């Protein structure tokens, strides 16, 4: 086999699934497995391209070969959680901050 960035012409047997918008999920296509939301993109594709890229050498734009339309790939909001608490012998309530 070969994993060059080319139009994939041999696939494993899996069924298709309807699109979801504004709810971030995980995804996989033409052998590209990742996690991110699916939505309509403002970008445009020439009629020979399959997937886009970004600065981070990752995938941010994909084309589903079901229907010739352009899709967007973006992971949703992520961050570290912090615990804002007073001293132990002062109270027991805590505060939650999402970064």
């Amino acid at each position: 086999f070969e994993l060059l960035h080319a139009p994939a012409t041999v696939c494993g047997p899996k069924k298709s699934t309807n699109l979801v918008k504004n709810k971030c999920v995980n995804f996989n296509f033409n052998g590209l497995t990742g996690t991110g939301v699916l939505t309509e993109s403002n970008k445009k594709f020439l009629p020979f391209q399959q997937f886009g890229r970004d600065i981070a050498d990752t995938t941010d734009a994909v084309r589903d070969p079901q229907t010739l339309e352009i899709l967007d790939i973006t992971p949703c909001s992520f961050g570290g959680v912090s615990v804002i608490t007073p001293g132990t012998n002062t109270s027991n309530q805590v505060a939650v901050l999402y970064q």
Binding site: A56, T58, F78, G79, Q99
Partner: peptide, 21 residues
């Protein structure tokens, strides 16, 4: 002040940037 305004105007995965206090 205009001097510090000019100074401000002349200054231009999984990694995040924490904002200063």
């Amino acid at each position: 002040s205009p001097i510090e305004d000019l100074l401000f105007n002349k200054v231009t995965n999984g990694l995040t940037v924490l904002p200063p206090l």
